[PDB]
Amino acid sequence: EYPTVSEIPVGEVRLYQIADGVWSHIATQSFDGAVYPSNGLIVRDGDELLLIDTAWGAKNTAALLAEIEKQIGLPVTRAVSTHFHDDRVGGVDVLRAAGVATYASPSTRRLAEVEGNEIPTHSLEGLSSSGDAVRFGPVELFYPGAAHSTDNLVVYVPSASVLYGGCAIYELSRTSAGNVADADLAEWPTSIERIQQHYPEAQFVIPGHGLPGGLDLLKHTTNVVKAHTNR
Ligand SMILES: O=C(O)c1ccc(-c2ccccc2)cc1CS
Ligand SMILES: [Zn+2]
Ligand SMILES: [Zn+2]
Ligand SMILES: [Zn+2]
């Protein structure tokens, strides 16, 4: 039932209800010949919505907001980007223009600026050291340490036991390392271990790209990362 890349044309966005008050949003983007899916999160925040990550581009994120308005009808008041790549900050300018307060760690904002990517307006304090966690409305933000990128954050929804791993966590079907140009391969396994130690009760695990699953996705990602390390 989870939407796949074959069922979403580039420019469209699907919402998928994980639990009460928690959705993922799925978009697709063309890159280097192929088409890839990408996940973000939507968490109900009383009568407001917290958005986790853009839909990978200005056009996709405009469609994301229209699809949220259509299906959910509650306002997106804040957005958190979980690292500096375009599938997380691409569309921040659209969000800002729509009145959404955009957020990221100073680490993410710095690396976005260096890359020439869009830059969330607000800075999330208290996430500079591995193992740091802060509350942000209905979720907890956690910095496990460098992994897919030096700045990657994970998000936990305690009310629903939903762990959003972002692109530090791979889906089961992916057996080869993907975009690791900005990764810390040496620290990635240790960072995953911090996630496991902090959220052992998670019942749903959302990867940055592809099908959700359970906590198995963490060990799977470690396996793939170590295999690539010994390439
Ligand atoms: O922003 C980028 O450069 C980027 C490009 C490609 C992917 C990708 C590749 C294969 C399968 C799923 C996703 C991801 C990212 C940002 S993490
Ligand atoms: Zn990335
Ligand atoms: Zn503001
Ligand atoms: Zn990604």
Q: Approximately how much beta-strand content do the residues carry?
A: 25-35%
Bound molecules: 4-phenyl-2-(sulfanylmethyl)benzoic acid, zinc ion
Structural domain count? 1
The sequence of SSEs as H and E is EEEEHEHHEHEEEEEHEH
**What is the helix content?**
25-40%
Distance between the termini: 35 Å
User: What structural category characterises the helix and strand content?
Assistant: alpha/beta
State the CATH topology: Metallo-beta-lactamase, Chain A
Query: How many β-strands, per DSSP?
Result: 12
Strand sequence of the main sheet, in spatial order? 1-2-3-4-5-6-7
Q: What form results from the Cα inertia axes?
A: globular
CATH superfamily: Ribonuclease Z/Hydroxyacylglutathione hydrolase-like
Q: State the CATH class.
A: Alpha Beta
Major sheet attributes: 7 strands, mixed
Task: Output the number of helix runs.
Answer: 6
Cα-atom Rg, whole angstroms?
16 Å
Question: From the coordinates shown, what is the CATH architecture?
Answer: 4-Layer Sandwich
PDB class: hydrolase
Keywords: metallo beta-lactamase, antibiotic resistance, carbapenamase. inhibitor, hydrolase
Assembly: monomeric
Entry title: VIM-2 Metallo Beta Lactamase in complex with 3-(mercaptomethyl)-[1,1'-biphenyl]-4-carboxylic acid
How is this structure best summarized?
The protein is α/β, with parallel strands linked by helices and 231 residues long. The protein has helices spanning 58-71, 86-89, 92-97, 106-115, 188-198, 216-229; strands at residues 13-19, 22-31, 34-45, 48-52, 76-80, 101-104, 122-123, 132-136, 139-143, 154-157, 162-166, 204-207.
